[PDB]
Structure formats: structure tokens, C-alpha cells
Amino acid sequence: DLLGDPIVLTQRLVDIPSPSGQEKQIADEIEDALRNLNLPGVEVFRFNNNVLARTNRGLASRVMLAGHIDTVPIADNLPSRVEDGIMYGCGTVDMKSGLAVYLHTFATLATSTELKHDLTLIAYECEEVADHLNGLGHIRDEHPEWLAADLALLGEPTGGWIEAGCQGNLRIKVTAHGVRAHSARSWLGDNAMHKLSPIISKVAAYKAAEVNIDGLTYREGLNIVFCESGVANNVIPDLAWMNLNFRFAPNRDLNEAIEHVVETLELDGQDGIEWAVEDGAGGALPGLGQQVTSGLIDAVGREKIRAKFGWTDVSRFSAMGIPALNFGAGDPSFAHKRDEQCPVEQITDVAAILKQYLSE
Amino acid sequence: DLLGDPIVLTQRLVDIPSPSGQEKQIADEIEDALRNLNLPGVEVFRFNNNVLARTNRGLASRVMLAGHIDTVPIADNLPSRVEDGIMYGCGTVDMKSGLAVYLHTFATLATSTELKHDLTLIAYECEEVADHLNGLGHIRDEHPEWLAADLALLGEPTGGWIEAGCQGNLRIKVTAHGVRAHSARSWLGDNAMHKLSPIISKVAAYKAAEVNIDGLTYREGLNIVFCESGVANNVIPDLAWMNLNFRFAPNRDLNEAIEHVVETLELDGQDGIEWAVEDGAGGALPGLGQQVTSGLIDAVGREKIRAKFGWTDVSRFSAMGIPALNFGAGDPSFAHKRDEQCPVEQITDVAAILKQYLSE
Ligand SMILES: [Cl-]
Ligand SMILES: [Cl-]
């Protein structure tokens, strides 16, 4: 592992197969590439298949550099080979590029006297699987102190752009109960499916709330994504359920997001209707209006920064009270596509931006 | 085959296995039991596995006696054995009782000088299967003249009661089309499922119309019986469909029933929504207020006659412009139950009622 060059490290990390669960090797290499390379003041920490590292140069602000080392199950995309200006392979866009960059820059500026911000580097595992294996997850649960920082940056592929923060994510399953009866004697029973009619109506009528933050504009989303009901053409259904997916702006927290959905749809009070949260997640504030961030906005340009409507591990930091942004290489597409295309150029563009940000 | 006794014929017809498609034998026996028994003026007609027979004694009114000779697939219910006042077996309640009765009475009164009404007897096949194999169906299609009568009686199990007419049956499949999009960017797409919200609301708000006929009261039914939509928790569904089941009073015909549903739910005009009829069927008027029926009402009692909310082949006659009633033996339950229980008594009760009706 070089760490002396950005593009080489990428093609090096990509050629090391790391589909979720088997990040063992790529993790071990990164640890040893940092240890055998004896950077003074730099602390290396091995936690499962996560690799943490931090400097303690006193210093005012602190920047977090995080990225996942795992990939989606490989599909004839390894090893990698560069084809005239562009690198094809697996992971070239999903982190392994940004990861190479986040690693490279930390290896260099850790001992550079012109480092304006303390650095933490977290290369974590199992991002591509249920939130009970997530590397950042266990870290937050056992060693939260390591997450501490004044700004967090996630290597997620953004094509050199800054996709600031992320929106909260809430999935609720609304279930209506009735009683079976022959569809010709409907009155003898109670149509469960019809009970969702009022709740459905409010959802289809709901106009998503919208909020401005740091010059950015986040828009919410409330949609029915699953609706299943029925047992026979001549039987009044006694059971009907839905899946509501609520995407809330980073100015809300789960408890608020939940309370908003439950109040607006009147999930409590409606007889025969039960609801429950199947998945919840916090949003992420970009905090662009802070000095800790000033430099980075400049090294990228105010007109290359949009809001992230999706959800990334960026929230795990914002939960800790840490502003976070998505900043990586490769087009957001080719994400899990069986032909990840990453313009070899963006690798150096990003690495350049980071130095300008962390040196001014 | 006796035809000299009602209860014997029943236990005889039951012991002859006739699950849909194999009514061959039971059909052949009935034909030959009528032919070799040379009733003068009586015409016997063999059509597929249906057995028709009619008298032509001039006479004013004419009564139709119809019943299906087939059963639901047998399930350890044959042969049959009577257990102290009650007969257990397969078909003992689903027609084979009424069929025995309808046969018996036709064999007797066909040459009796005290027969007030001309008689047609139709013992048809494949009632227990899609309406493209139905015996009465093909008869109506090729030899409608045989269905001609002033009153029709179906041997369906009603436990000696008269279940008058039947309600129409309409199933429409409403389908909404949208466009896929990430549930966090819902605005980029169009939620198909939300498009059914207005139509669903009208259905859940619709109060079924209700009509009185001949002292009887029919109530309609409009219910969603199937609702399926969704492709992923993070994907705006582009496709959503429903199954509406409309049960209309016998004062409406299919074209009216359809037009009522389509107007009330505004199925035309709503953009992105297509609808289609999957199944339709006419209702059946009881016509109890007619002289042709006078006798039968008396031989049963005005307080043993209720309205049939379901649907029976009784409609196939009412379509021909012929009032029709459901009058059979055995409890309406035990219908397709793996233990058909028919009180051996009701066999003679019904046969008695019929004579009193057809002799006065
Ligand atoms: Cl996004
Ligand atoms: Cl009924």
C-alpha cells in the first residue's frame, strides 16, 4: 500500500476484494500500511475490521475523514484495469476511490506543519448490510469518543461535488384489522381495507414540507410504498397493511419525525388500526455556516454544493452533534452497477481540494 | 333409479360419484330412467351431460325445475349411509337432494290429471366450475326455447325455505399507472398507489343502495376485495390495482350495474387510471306477486321466504325474463364441507310442498 500516490492506492484497494463480510484482508493491509509507516503523534486503532487513526496536534477545529472499505458482492468486476483516462472495476466509485483519497491525504498532512485541523480517519466495515453490522455503528456504541470532531466528511461518490448532510428516514407499517364476511353480505363483516381509506387520503393529499438550510433547500417525502390486502374475490378482507416512507429534513429528529407522521395521519385514535416503526434514522446537518467549514466551501465553490435527499452514514455523525457532508469521487451512478466507471481524473481533483482545505 | 320414492333416489344419486367433469354416468342413468319409464307426452332430451324433459298438456302457466347433477371434488364422503334420521355423504345437501326431489315430482305429476302447470325439468352439468362449462349456459346459448317457462325453481339447498331471486354480481379491476422514483425524491416520479386514494375514498364512503321487491328487501354491496401495490421500500410504485366487487339488486341489469359503478367512482376522466370488467352477471327477480307463484307461496308460508343476496344459476332464467326462486333441501351450510349433513326429513317435506303447489 503506497499512500504516497492517490490513483495507485485506488487501483490497489480495488484489486483487493472486499465484499461485505470479507473486508478482513483490505482492513489488515490498511492497518499495517499505517503502522509500519511510523507517523509520529498518529494513533492507530484496530476495531473489528475497522481502522481508526487520529492526530493530536492540539489545534482548534477537527475534521473527520470516514469511508467504508467494503463493497457490494463482486460481479466480474475484478481485477481492475484503467482504459485511457478512466478506471473500470468494482468499488472504483463506491468508496474505494474516496477511501484512497481520504487515506492518502491523512498519511501526508498528519505530520505537515501546515495542518490547520486535527484529523481523525475512520475506515469502517459492513456498510452494505443491515444496520446491525455497520462499522460506524459499533464504534458509536462502544467508542463514541473516536467519532468526536467539528466536521465530518464521508467519501461517498459525489463526483467531486459536495452533497451536504442528508435527510432523515422513517418507515412505518400501518395495519388495519376487520372481520371476514361474504362480499354479498358485506354488512355482516367489517372491511379492513376500507379502514385505510382516511389515512391513505391524508397521505395522498399531504404536501411535503420544505426547509432552507445554509443556502441549501431540503424537501421532504411522504409516500405509500407498499399496500397489500385481500384474501378472495368474494370475501371481505379482515386484514390490510401499508408501508409509509417518510423522509424528513435534518432539522427534525426521529422522535419529531415520528410524532409528525402520527399526528398528521391520526394513527392513534382510529379504532382497529395499529401502527409500528419498522426503521428509523436521523438526518444530518451540513453546518456550512461554520468557520470549521469555511475553507472547504472555498476549495469547491458555492455553486458545486447541493443537498443530499437520500440517507448516508453521514447521519451517524450528526447524531453525535457533528455537521457532516458527502464528498467523494466517481459519479453517484455506477453505484452498485456491474461496471463501476470512475474518471481517473476526479481521484486527484478531490485529493487536491482536500489539501487546499486542510492547509489554509 | 326409482323415481317412485324421494329419499331412496337421493341416496341413489349420491352413491353415483359425479364430481365436475365426470357427471357422465349419473347423467346417463337419469336419461335412461326417464326413457325406459315411458311417460306419454313427456319429451326427453340429451344435451352433453344435461338431461332435459318437458310436458305439453297445453295448460296456462309453466314451471321450470332445474338443478345441477355435479358436485365438488369428493373427499372421503362416498358412499353414503343414513344415521338415524339424517343422511351423511357428498352432495346430499348440494343439489343431489333437491335433484332427487325435482326428479321424483316430475316423474309423478307428468301424467297426473291434476297438474296445474306444464313442467320442464333440467338436470344440468358442470355448475361447479367457470361459467364456460355451465350446463344451463350452453342450453341458453344453443337451445334457449327449452328454458322457456313462467316460473323457475332451483334445487339449491335452502333447508325447505324459499330464497327468492338473487343479486347481480360485478367485479371490476381498477388499475392506476404512475412512474418509478426513489422515495426520497418522490417528486421526480408519480406515486401510482396515491392515485387510487380518491376512488378508494368514494368506495369506503359509499352506502349500499337498498330496494324492496314483493315484500322482500334486497341490499347491495360495494367492497374492495383485493388491493396490491409496491415494489420496494425506497421506490415510488408505478403500478397499483384493485378489485371492486359490486352486488346489485335484481332491479338492475349488468349494463346498469356497470354504469352505476363507473359514474359513482368516476372511473372515466381520472388520468392514469384504467378499469375493466373481469366478471359480470345478472340478478334474478322472484316475481312472488304473480299468480303463477301464488300456490307455492301458500305451500311454504309467507314467513319462510327471504331474499337471496348471493348469486345462483337462478339468474340465467331471469335473464330470459323468467322469475326464479331457490328452493331445495339440506342446510345452506355443509355446502362444500367435507361432511354434508342432510336431515332425511326435509327430502319428503320439499317433495310434499311441490305436490301441493303443482296440484292446486
Ligand atoms: Cl440525493
Ligand atoms: Cl344469501
Author numbering:
A (entry chain A), B (entry chain A): 10 to 369
Give verbatim lines from the article.
C. glutamicum is a Gram-positive bacterium that finds industrial use in the production of vitamins and amino acids, including glutamic acid, which is used in the production of the flavoring agent monosodium glutamate.
The diffraction data for the Cgl1109 crystal structure were quite anisotropic and the effective overall B factors along the principal axes of the unit cell ranged from 60 to 110 Å2. For Cgl1109, DEN refinement resulted in a model that is closer to the true structure, producing improved model phases that in turn provide a better starting point for automated model building. The improved model phases also provided more significant peaks in anomalous difference Fourier maps to better locate the six selenium sites of the protein. There were several regions that required correction of register shifts and rebuilding of α-­helices that were not corrected even in the second round of DEN refinement and automated model building. It was performed against diffraction data collected at the high-energy remote wavelength. c maps initially suggested the possible presence of two zinc ions in the putative catalytic site, which would be expected owing to the addition of 6 mM ZnCl2 during cocrystallization (which was added based on putative functional annotation and ligand screening in a fluorescence-based thermal shift assay).
